[PDB]
Design a protein around this nucleic acid. Structure first.
Ligand SMILES: [Zn+2]
Lengths: 181, 94, 54, 81, 96, 96, 83, 93
DNA sequence: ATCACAGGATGTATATATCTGACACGTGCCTGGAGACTAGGGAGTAATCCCCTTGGCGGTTAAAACGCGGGGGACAGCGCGTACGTGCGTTTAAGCGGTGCTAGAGCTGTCTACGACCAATTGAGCGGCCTCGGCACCGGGATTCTCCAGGAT
DNA sequence: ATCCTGGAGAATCCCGGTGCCGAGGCCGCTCAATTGGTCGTAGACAGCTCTAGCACCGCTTAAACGCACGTACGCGCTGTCCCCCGCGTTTTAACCGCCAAGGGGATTACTCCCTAGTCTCCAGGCACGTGTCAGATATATACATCCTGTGAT
């Protein structure tokens, strides 16, 4: 929901009562992109029918490339109290890095509240993808570890292998659907 | 020693609810103290007039409410009214 | 609002300046305190377009 | 302790003008500015003196300045209040 | 012999002075100005250092607001340069 | 044929309206405008005739003072004709 | 019944007459509209306060004093209608 | 069903300055608004001066100071002179 | 003759390491907040009286609305020249730090003249009444404006 | 194109009389001022402490001062054009006076109950003390913006 805001808020068109509609924004977001991709003349771009809300749009470029597009709201307020104990890097990357990161914004992605046997349509989920990126590229408490071979650790290597293990298994068993989620 | 009153302690607490991870300089605090005393006087001052105008010896939640509407502009005035109205409703219920 | 200003400036606290920026950027507070002079508040960085070159 | 209005240097005047968004300053501004600043100070200082005198004091305090400014539609925050 | 053109620097100074919060008027000079004015009401008067600062900040704030209106008047008059009269007009409209 | 030139009458009217003390705005029209505005905030809104008159004199006094400053702005701009921007400058300087 | 467009009740001659009293000699055609948009704000601010005072007092009819307080609040005092 | 005003006193004052001049009911109403406006202000400031100096009593001194803060130039001055006397005299009266 | 580009020059933003003093947090009071109690005056409620606001009617009249012609001001464009801006080198006194003095703010404790408070008495002032006199309006005449024609510049 | 009378044609001032309703003076009466006495505490006063405001010294150095170059700006002049003004005729609804109805403001009488004022007790909040982290400072590197030449178009 939006707080008091005197001037006109242009996102008002996506409001439903007090609440910003994830459904409207996602629906319109892909509608805009759809109309616009038909104006891409040198590259053939096809839109996929949407299923979930984490990727708002999937674009299909010729016969080789796919692009998942995620829409996110940006908030520069202090992070919600529920994040207070998150970003548990204090003993890893340091409490001071944790503090620095938390002076940055957090994000909200249109996301229906997936639950036991159903979901809520206009919920938004907290997103820290930008922090995740910063961490992956600043995974050391030395913070420059791996940008120099003297301080080469395998955190990044282990993650790639872990991702690769899961991805390979998902590909291996994509047909048995066990691993789709 | 003589002793002085301020809202410094209450200002800190409010800051924590909006920004749990931030602090405040001594000057900003001095300013917030100047601010609180200014607003207090105005509301109390206007409330005084309303009590006088309407022939009363007492200031109630209404005189405070009306003073707020007259002093504060647009919506800001409203939230102050909503919170006050509630706080009284609640105080006697708490 | 001042806290947001503090964050804009990559700080961990509010200083008199942040209070000034906050008050002025917010139209209704700008008015409530429209006659208030803030010690070390400075001013908003408003430069008239006619003063700028092409 | 005379014509201390000249202690307000030209650059000091220009810098204030700049802060106000002034890009170019006429050569006759310096004097005109002074004729205004002085009046402002006269009105504020005098009230502060009046308050100081009422209180039977000799030293003007920040509070006496604040009252002087206040009543002219100018609350100043930072020195108490 | 590199130079920056007229107005490039002027705009730069505007940017900076709008941004910063510090006093622009020299202190000992200002302090003395206050006293010279004060002595016209009363000799052997004293000031707290905080009183002088309080006066100085209010004084600068006044002039800056005046200059902002002066600047608008000059613009209204299709001019970049401010003239004594632009100050006078702004003041008058304000009731001075 | 005979007639006065443009501006001869205008000056005359300036004299005359400055001179007279009556209302320049029609009463029932003004009264209705007050109610039309009033009906926004609430219904069951009634006015005493003295309240409406009090509003009218204050309203005219406001506009007249505004026009005086507007006129000066037009003069500042070296003109006789007042334009919306001369009004706007005056208001802005006032702080509206 | 509801009212409307009484802003036009402030006729052109009325605006000119006010302008003339103010020393205005010559008036651009767009002034009429521009002036109304300013008058209106003034009226809105005064009337509203008068109503606010009226409501506080729990009355329906606005009196001269309610208007006087409203105008005083905006800092423009008015004599002869109470005080 | 009864009000109070200064109409009677204002009328008399007019004679002290202009013995042969009359006055409309409106001019009187205006003068009444004037008197009440000035009264409130001075009393307001006198209250405050007592408050600032952390006191409960308003004396002729607070009135005097208030006069100066509100009135400009000689009006402030003649008023102080007159106020001083009225008190000086009232006491000896 | 104009566009844009590339290079240089300059100034800004950026990461980095070190310093220090201004905040954040903890301790020990101590006096103002909170609980508990009575007493009584203000605010709330309803009766009801009647004043004033609302709505409506019909004339009558000035005031608005509309249209037309034509002068006069607003505006754009041009060119002159000078009054400001920018950068350099020399001069000034502002700012910093430290020292030393004591004038005056700030607090304590004592004592008493002053004002809140209450009860009794009464005459200064407010509401309602009549009277008629200064002011507003009417109509006529005087003279004081503005504007054009025709004859000077 | 611009100055100087002299007349014509409205518009504005002055003159004298009508008549009306708003000011100004009088009478009753009533309740807010005045008086007179009591209580207690706010303020006047003297005394003492010791903070902090004044004055002075010398050194460092960033600001201020003055000058020279040159060019972007302000200013005045010209011509177009178009959009306001001023007048006359037609149309509208504002204003005035009168009437009736009734809604809601103003006053009355009465009663609690919601506050002020009192005393008691304890913990919430302020003055002080101490430790260390955020921001300021300063160094050095790299990116961004600005302004002449320089060829391409
Ligand atoms: Zn690593």
């Amino acid at each position: 929901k939006f707080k008091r805001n005197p001037k006109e808020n242009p996102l008002s068109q996506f409001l439903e009562g007090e609440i910003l509609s994830a459904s409207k924004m996602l629906s319109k977001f892909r509608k805009i992109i759809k109309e616009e991709i038909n104006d891409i003349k040198d590259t053939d771009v096809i839109m996929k029918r949407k299923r979930g809300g984490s990727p708002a749009v999937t674009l299909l470029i010729s016969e080789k490339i796919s692009v998942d597009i995620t829409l996110a709201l940006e908030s520069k307020s202090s992070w919600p109290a529920s994040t207070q104990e998150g970003l548990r890097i204090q003993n890893w990357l340091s409490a001071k890095v944790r503090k620095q990161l938390r002076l940055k914004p957090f994000y909200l992605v249109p996301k229906h509240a997936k639950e036991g046997n159903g979901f809520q349509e206009e919920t938004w989920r907290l997103s820290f993808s930008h922090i995740e990126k910063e961490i992956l590229n600043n995974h050391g408490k030395s913070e420059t570890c791996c940008e120099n071979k003297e301080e080469k650790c395998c955190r990044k290597d282990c993650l790639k292998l872990m991702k690769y293990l899961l991805e390979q298994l998902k590909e291996r068993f994509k047909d048995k659907k066990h691993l789709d989620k | 020693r003589s002793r002085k009153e301020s809202y410094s302690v209450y200002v800190y607490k409010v800051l924590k609810q909006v920004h749990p991870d931030t602090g405040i300089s001594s000057k900003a605090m001095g300013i917030m103290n100047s601010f609180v005393n200014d607003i207090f006087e105005r509301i109390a001052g206007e409330a005084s007039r309303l009590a006088h105008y309407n022939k009363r010896s007492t200031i109630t939640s209404r005189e405070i409410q009306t003073a707020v509407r007259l002093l504060l502009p647009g919506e800001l005035a409203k939230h102050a009214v909503s919170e006050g109205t509630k706080a009284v409703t609640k105080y006697t219920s708490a | 609002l001042a806290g947001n200003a503090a964050r804009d400036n990559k700080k961990t606290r509010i200083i008199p300046r942040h209070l000034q920026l906050a008050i002025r950027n917010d139209e209704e507070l700008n008015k409530l305190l429209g006659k208030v002079t803030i010690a070390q508040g400075g001013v908003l960085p408003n430069i008239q377009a006619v003063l700028l070159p092409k | 302790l005379r014509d201390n209005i000249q202690g307000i240097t030209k650059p000091a005047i220009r810098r204030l003008a700049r802060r106000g968004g002034v890009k170019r300053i006429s050569g006759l501004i310096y004097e005109e500015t002074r004729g205004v600043l002085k009046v402002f100070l006269e009105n504020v200082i005098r009230d502060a003196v009046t308050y100081t005198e009422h209180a039977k004091r000799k030293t003007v305090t920040a509070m006496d300045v604040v009252y002087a400014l206040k009543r002219q539609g100018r609350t100043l925050y930072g020195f108490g209040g | 012999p590199h130079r920056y053109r007229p107005g490039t620097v002027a705009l730069r100074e505007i940017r900076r002075y709008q941004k910063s919060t510090e006093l622009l008027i020299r202190k000992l000079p200002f302090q003395r100005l206050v006293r010279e004015i004060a002595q016209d009401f009363k000799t052997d008067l004293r000031f707290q250092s905080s009183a002088v600062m309080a006066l100085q900040e209010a004084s600068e704030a006044y002039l800056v607001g005046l200059f902002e209106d002066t600047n608008l008047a000059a613009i209204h008059a299709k001019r970049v340069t401010i003239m004594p009269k632009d100050i006078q007009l702004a003041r008058r409209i304000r009731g001075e």
